[PDB]
A and B are shown apart, each in its own frame.
Chain A
């Protein structure tokens, strides 16, 4: 169920099981990496790049090709961006949540009696702290990194 509201929604994607790219897909790996870099330089999120590649170029996910460098793993958008030095410095989901929290806090400075929206800020900051615990455990954040709204 949903982490806080306890609803049981089921909508999502239904990926067929397959190994190789389909016969009708003509793009090679080099073209796909070039497209990913171009789209990232245009200023899109990692989720947005995959959406554009699926919708406009007929590319079902880049996780259908093996990594040309490491045969032990398949390709992902973040791995491709890492291979060129354009990977995000902060993980994207944490960044989007922090951005949502900054906008909400200045709303609350002008609306001190809006209590229902304040509980939303509390839930968002709970999500942020869960994620920071996980990322410090994995080493994707420095041990001294701290989240402070006054920053």
Chain B
């Protein structure tokens, strides 16, 4: 039914949005509280995580790029790349990484994962130019422009980002057949998150 119980989703704060809203995000929004804060629907998150796990398992592993400027997302993307074999770029994204072949670390992926369209704007801009599919994590305040596959979640919290990337890595492993069952994946969620 669910990849994890809804209690863990709620305790990790996946459903907590922001005081701002956007017209194209309303298909994912569940309700608004009395203090003006918008809440996300968690069943949609589970469905999109399953679909995203199926989509990403079909690409060649070293052709996947994951990025995260925001500090609370840096350890999760590094751990995701270590587990799945995907390239991972935490911190400042050097302009021209995907458009300037003369640069030392020039790299053209086949698919890109964006932690936040607002903060990772340089990576998204360069990815539009080279015509690859874009997968993104979207909060209540984000727009859906140039997003080809959207995953609705809180993308600012430490525990939520840890949980999202942990689930996504497990789904990829299960879908490509490197683990024969879900129970086999014995890597705790706490290893994806930043400490202190």
The answer to whether A and B touch in the complex, with CB atoms under 8 Å apart, is: no
